[PDB]
Design a protein around this ligand. Sequence first.
Ligand SMILES: CC(C)(O)[C@H](F)CNC(=O)c1cnc(-c2ccc3cc(C#N)cnn23)cc1N[C@]12CC[C@](O)(CC1)CC2
Length: 284
Amino acid sequence: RFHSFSFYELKNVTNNFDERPISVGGNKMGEGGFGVVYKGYVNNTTVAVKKLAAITTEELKQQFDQEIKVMAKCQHENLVELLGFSSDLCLVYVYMPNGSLLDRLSCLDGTPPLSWHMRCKIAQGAANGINFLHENHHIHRDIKSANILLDEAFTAKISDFGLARASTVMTSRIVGTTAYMAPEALRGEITPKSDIYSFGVVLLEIITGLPAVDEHREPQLLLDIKEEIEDEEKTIEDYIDKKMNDADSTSVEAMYSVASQCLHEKKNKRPDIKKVQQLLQEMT
Ligand SMILES: CC(C)(O)[C@H](F)CNC(=O)c1cnc(-c2ccc3cc(C#N)cnn23)cc1N[C@]12CC[C@](O)(CC1)CC2
């Protein structure tokens, strides 16, 4: 199944969890909401380790459990692969050579901008992954561009299943990234339709290249830009990412239409993941 790695083995490959950037000689490639991630070559396998960092110490460990439990039942080309763990805190995965969709849309660390054809394939790959999760009666609850990772071929892979749940119920701990969350999820509802809403936000990020939340931007919330388009003030061509030259207006408007259906405030009128798949497949 999974390999139980040892703590010290992870420290040696991470250069003692060197939080410095790679170009400076460290190992940190990024940080999550609940942990940090470093590169570390292990048995010639380049690997990303997730030293969790808390929201008490118990809950952080139960989410450590949930990721392992979901990753054992859900293997798919559009999901990340859990290689193993270190508990005596750490979750070991196959290193994704191209990081997160969020960082690549912002061209972080100097990576070239994504073309429209890569973005369309990434969206289809991400929807294909969410479809596999929803087919197995699992809800991600944190669909966002930072949790859509990209391999050497820019194949989209959904990651971070610590918040995942079995597949409408209510909870006492509202968790997630608010800039992506559906209104019902912000109140404590758990439904796969929230995943659809959050995927619509990612589709907006893909079209525009704008992060879902930007503190130095007006509007700060990418959702607040859809309404500015909807009330006819502007159009979606005014917000197409300018860091691409292979975008056609017919396909861009098709992905926006998918995003708009996904972003319906009322959840029951949002399409399910299978319909979102079909619409994204029709676009190409
Ligand atoms: C060369 C480049 C262009 O620099 C490139 F980017 C280098 N490769 C990476 O940076 C990078 C590589 N493999 C992963 C990876 C692989 C599996 C998992 C699982 C889980 C969870 N659960 C998180 N990560 N993960 C994450 C990575 N980077 C992140 C940066 C910001 C984040 O928020 C934390 C880590 C999301 C992705």
